[PDB]
Structures are given as C-alpha cells and as structure tokens.
Design a protein around this ligand. Structure first.
Ligand code: PPY
Ligand code: CO
Ligand code: CO
Ligand code: FE
Length: 225
C-alpha cells in the first residue's frame, strides 16, 4: 500500500538546499545509500580539497571547471568528461572562470560494491549512439557504473515502461518531460532527480515541443557490460 505522496518521496525525493561560506550552493537529493548533488560554483572560486569514505562521481553540466582528484588536475568541459574519486581519495576544484559552473556529483556507499576508477580518475566519452530511434545517448563506463546522457526528443520521444535489476538514478538537465516510476508520474524540470532501486518499473515520455536532456546512471552497467 503506497500513497501518491508516499511514492513521490521514494522515487523523486524533495531536495534540500545547502549553502557553503565560500558561496557554493548545492541541491541535495537522497535515497538510501546514494546522494545526488547539483552544485552551483561561483566565478573564480576554490572548493577546498577533501575526502570521505563514500565514492563520488562528478560531471560538469554547464561552464568549465578545473578539477583535482589525487594529484591529477584536469579541465572539465560541459558534459564531455566525468571523474571517479574512489573512497578516501582527496579531491577538490576551482572555478577559474568569469562564469558560474553548474555541476553534478553522485556520492555513494553500498554493500558489495568495489569502487574503481581509471588510473588517472577521469572518464572520456566511450561511445555515442541512438539507444532508440531518434534518441541519442552518450556513455561513460566503469566496471561498476555506467553514465548515460540521454536526449529525448519532444513530440512523443519515449522510453517505454520497463524494469531491470540494475539500480538507475538520474537527473534532468534540460527541457522537461514526464517520468514515471512505478505508480508515480512527475513532470521533470532542470535539476529534478530520480532514484530507481532494482526491479522498480520506470519510463519516460516527452510531450513538449522540444528535446529534453537527462543524465542517467546505472549500477552496475547495463549496456556496456
Ligand atoms: O535505458 C534505460 O534503462 C532507461 O531507463 C532509459 C531512460 C532514459 C530517460 C528517462 C528514463 C529512462
Ligand atoms: Co566529495
Ligand atoms: Co531503465
Ligand atoms: Fe507536439
């Protein structure tokens, strides 16, 4: 027995706003062992190095960010790179530009997961292709995680309703569309996050007049095994 509002809090949890002294603002959404943070990093601003037991996956959605993981510093272009900072590995960043950076982090710690990364921490685009006709996706791949950018066209662009054992978590980064998880449909906006546990049915349809974009993350990988 799950109410409408009950289900909303599970699959599309209400974010909290976090503000740091340095000026960074974060929108934080949580379900169980996984946290999604959308960060707004102001111009010419440092994010002090730190480290934690949780693994963290990061990506720039807008702007350009100087990112440090371990002793590897790398310029991050919007949506063209991701990094993984394994547990306890120190990491921080600087917005070294005149413009605000919008970024996304996933912080996670779940049993029976080994958190590896490329030797230099950063992932480049593995492959871009249509997942479904007209639906362009872009993959970033590790053993235990698969990042999939998706463009869902307007005018009926749709991911049919389905499920899989893979956990799938994500966040809308453009336009709008309807997403349903089990018995719950939400109109996604920029920043709306969703969390699907194993075997929870879900789908999406974009009945707007323009394409929408999303970031979707599989644990473990679903397409590039
Ligand atoms: O490929 C899947 O398993 C998906 O769930 C794809 C997807 C894309 C956009 C919104 C929801 C699901
Ligand atoms: Co961190
Ligand atoms: Co899915
Ligand atoms: Fe239309």
């Amino acid at each position: 027995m799950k109410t409408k509002e009950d289900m909303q809090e599970l699959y599309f949890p209400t974010p909290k706003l976090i503000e740091w002294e340095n000026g960074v603002r974060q929108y934080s959404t949580v379900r169980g062992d996984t946290e999604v943070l959308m960060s707004y990093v102001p111009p010419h601003t440092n994010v002090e190095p730190h480290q934690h037991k949780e693994v963290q996956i990061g990506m720039v959605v807008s702007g350009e960010l100087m990112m440090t993981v371990g002793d590897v510093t790398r310029k991050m272009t919007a949506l063209e790179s991701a990094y993984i900072a394994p547990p306890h590995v120190p990491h921080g960043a600087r917005n070294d530009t005149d413009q605000e950076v919008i970024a996304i982090d996933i912080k996670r710690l779940k049993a029976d997961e080994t958190y590896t990364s490329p030797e230099d921490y950063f992932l480049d685009i593995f492959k871009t292709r249509d997942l479904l006709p007209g639906m362009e996706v872009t993959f970033f791949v590790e053993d235990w995680v698969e990042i999939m950018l998706a463009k869902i066209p307007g005018n009926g662009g749709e991911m049919p309703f389905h499920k899989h054992r893979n956990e799938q978590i994500g966040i809308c980064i453009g336009g709008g569309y309807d997403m349903t998880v089990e018995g719950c449909t939400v109109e996604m906006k920029f920043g709306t996050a969703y969390f699907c546990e194993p075997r929870e049915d879900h789908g999406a349809i974009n009945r707007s007049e323009k394409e929408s974009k999303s970031i979707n993350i599989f644990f473990p990988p679903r397409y590039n095994r």
